[PDB]
Design a protein around this nucleic acid. Structure first.
Ligand SMILES: [Mn+2]
Ligand SMILES: [Mn+2]
Ligand SMILES: [Mn+2]
Ligand SMILES: [Mn+2]
Lengths: 105, 94, 87, 95, 96, 78, 103, 95
DNA sequence: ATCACCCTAACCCTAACCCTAACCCTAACCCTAACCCTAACCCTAACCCTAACCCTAACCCTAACCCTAACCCTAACCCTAACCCTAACCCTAACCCTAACCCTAACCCTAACCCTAACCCTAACCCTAACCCTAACCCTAAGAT
DNA sequence: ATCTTAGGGTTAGGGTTAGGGTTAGGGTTAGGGTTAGGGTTAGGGTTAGGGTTAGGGTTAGGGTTAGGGTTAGGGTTAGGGTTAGGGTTAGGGTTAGGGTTAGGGTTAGGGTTAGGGTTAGGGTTAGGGTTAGGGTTAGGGTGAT
């Protein structure tokens, strides 16, 4: 192996993450393991989002993930909905939900 | 002009590992990059404060880990800490 | 090379049909007549707050052009973090 | 002729199922330049800066109409009133 | 014998013009240590750490009872019900 | 110990909140809401205590937890 | 002192040390701690003013947290600035909803 | 033990300046110190981001300026910006 | 509870536009060596937490009573949905130009590094006035005649 | 409203605690002077926003019928509220032990600095597929007979 991402078994860039931490004004020094752990967490969460969104793309009969799919995936997972609870997905739309009280008799 | 960074290359890689027959729109990728940047700054900032509180100059994997523990839902945090500890261990091996 | 047009009463551009559509996505079955002027009041406050902060960023940058990032930075400040327009 | 509430329920399903912006783009861009210019003169807007604002506004308003409807239903009503928008904004801490 | 709603209005005036804590300190400290042990065993608490928590709880709860009452009144009621606490918490974004 | 936060202690908190009348189901609901509030705050405080490699939860750990929860407290050190 | 040079009671010296130590930027301007110490001192003065007045009103000489609370929540702008803050031992502002008031 | 900082000395000075016949409780001072620290962080952090956004390596009075403009209220920001500009000008006068 | 008609969903394919695989070249990450201050060990002070005792007394709970608020049902009005059509005004693809942004070359002063120096502020003590605690007092509505 | 009734703020007395005036010296901040680069200069490219022309068709504005939901009423049930008196449990008042947090010193090594090296990925162009938009298709559920 040669990239730091290769050594940690990650798709996400350990190299970049380290640079962004140092150049981001977070602390005097950055540990060797910190960008590795962070790149890993960022990669895990993007895999989790892409998983549910790709699944929603597949239901809406589409081949490509559009923001609607990311919205349906986010707002249908309890934990992603909490994590992104005060975030707006541009072109996401809403989840379909009519209040049962409004429904006809 | 001046060069612009992105997580585009990696989001596409992580998409192909997960759903190898699914694609991503220009805007949907926009949202994915916005997502990576938000969580990077949420974790990096929390870790920045942790090191500060404890009178430490460095942000280590230990600061990243308790930041994840603080910011992520119970089960996402559980897996992210696993995923992270795994990467560090593998890195320390290589 | 010369003088622009005066801008006035543009909140009336947010029409009753456009306000209905927003209420329908919000899952609203019936809308009072007083709602339309009230939504106009609330929307103006929302924009004043966001644009004020965005323009404060534009100004700090020593720029005349309000960028997508200035709007994005303003919303994050307002606690209304937006995905898709950079950042 | 459809019964009162039928086209209304159909409309909720229509717009809930989509993502397209619901305010017209030029009337909205005018409101933005009006409000902005009447805080600082000779300002320019990137096309996307206005789009970012419109996305934000409509997302805000739709989510407000959600809480508003919850308030109208709370008071055993079906139709939203200013007092519902006001209570939602009060509890939201917008005041 | 006072009319229904008189001692109640008097009580609001009493506690509104006061700052003293309204939950008893030892029952509260027990709840804190209980919840904490369910998180990590053999934990110690600085006296002030419990006081900081109590101040926080009571401040939270009083402000919740404010929004709750606003909801009760909205529904043309005088008396607070769970559906009011629930709506306050939903709009506050604590609940779904 | 959750029953330690009594019906009269809960009524006092509703009076400061300016409540004229209280339903019977309110007491068990306030109990539910208070437990969630404490679980959330103490969880985060203990996470800080743990990071510090400490056994003792300090005022600051509680202060740091509240700031995170968006319920910033004035008067306990930070 | 730098505080003497800027005509401030608040510490310009400390503020400068806390800014570079605090991990906010690689460098800190000569004017930044001065401007900040000034703003911090102004806001301290604004609070102490209204609180001292509320302490005066209560037949009291010493400012207690209640006074800070009454001062904060009675000013529209301080209430907004400290809207998501809790003053320990502050209490609430007296306010009964008119609907609850007797016939 | 180990040294503990505080704004105690200054809060008392500013108090002696506004209310020369008024005092402060241990807890009320606690709240005052908590207040100074919160606003210090709020402004310092906002200024930290401003410099960062604009690819500028230093926090200057200009970063403090617009942070105050973003964080302070309609009229408090007006006076805080005045008191700040005043202090800097006076400081630049005195070597 | 049957039939009519408006709707959306969904088939067809033609249609364009945006995706993604190609190119390559620029620029960031990577390797290496010597660098140092942090954070690691170590011992052990002096802090404060928990643990266990007592005394009522402020405070909680059960179980006295009846007030009036919440809830259902009804039937009053009238607010607000649904539908039609005319004409504005938005959306559309164009056109153009110049202010506005920002690259990237040159320069200097601002900012940080160092050390030692005065000088401010913390930790500590001790006094005393402000505030607290108690009993008697007038004001002030509270509920029933 | 006018009659007795409670209670809470008011006055004054004299106790207790913790504000704030005070001591010393520790460590913070300041004035010395060197060093380096970030950011202020003026300049040009060059992107791109604002303004204009153009058209046509969606989308809006406005008035019209009437459903049907909103809100007044009265009249039912019972749920919380006052008050009371027995009595658990809370709050200080005041002990001791010893695990805990941790000051502080010695030392190693992780994290930084450096410039050359090269590989990854940003920005370029471009062929083809997924999506879009216009044509009818049938069933679907709606609301009048
Ligand atoms: Mn009806
Ligand atoms: Mn009952
Ligand atoms: Mn190394
Ligand atoms: Mn690319």
């Amino acid at each position: 192996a040669k990239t730091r991402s290769s050594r940690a078994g990650l798709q996400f860039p350990v190299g970049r993450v380290h640079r962004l931490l140092r150049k981001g004004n977070y602390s005097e020094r950055v540990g060797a393991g910190a960008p590795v752990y962070l790149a890993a967490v960022l990669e895990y969460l993007t895999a989790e989002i892409l998983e549910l969104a790709g699944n929603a793309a597949r239901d809406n009969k589409k081949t490509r993930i559009i923001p609607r799919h990311l919205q349906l995936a986010i707002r249908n997972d309890e934990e992603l909905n909490k994590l992104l609870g005060r975030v707006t997905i541009a072109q996401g739309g809403v989840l379909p939900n009519i209040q049962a009280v409004l429904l006809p008799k | 002009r001046s060069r612009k960074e992105s997580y585009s290359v990696y989001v596409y890689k992580v998409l192909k590992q997960v759903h190898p027959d699914t694609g991503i729109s220009s805007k949907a990728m926009g949202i994915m990059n916005s997502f990576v940047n938000d969580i990077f700054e949420r974790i990096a900032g929390e870790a920045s404060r942790l090191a500060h509180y404890n009178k430490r100059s460095t942000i280590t994997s230990r600061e990243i880990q308790t930041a994840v523990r603080l910011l992520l839902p119970g089960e996402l945090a559980k897996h992210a800490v696993s995923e992270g500890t795994k990467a560090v261990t593998k890195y320390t091996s290589a | 090379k010369r003088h622009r047009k005066v801008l006035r009463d543009n909140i009336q551009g947010i029409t009753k049909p456009a306000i209905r559509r927003l209420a329908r996505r919000g899952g609203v079955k019936r809308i009072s007549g007083l709602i339309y002027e009230e939504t106009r009041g609330v929307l103006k406050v929302f924009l004043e707050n966001v644009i004020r902060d965005a323009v404060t960023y534009t100004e700090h940058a020593k720029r005349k052009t309000v960028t997508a990032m200035d709007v994005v930075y303003a919303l994050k400040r307002q606690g209304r973090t937006l995905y898709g327009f950079g950042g | 002729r459809y019964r009162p509430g039928t086209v209304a329920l159909r409309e909720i399903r229509r717009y809930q199922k989509s993502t397209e912006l619901l305010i017209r783009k030029l009337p909205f861009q005018r409101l933005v330049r009006e409000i902005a210019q009447d805080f600082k003169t000779d300002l320019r807007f990137q096309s996307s800066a206005v789009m970012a604002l419109q996305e934000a506004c409509e997302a805000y308003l739709v989510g407000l109409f959600e809480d508003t409807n919850l308030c109208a239903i709370h008071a055993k009503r079906v139709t939203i009133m200013p007092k519902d928008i006001q209570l939602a904004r009060r509890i939201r801490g917008e005041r």
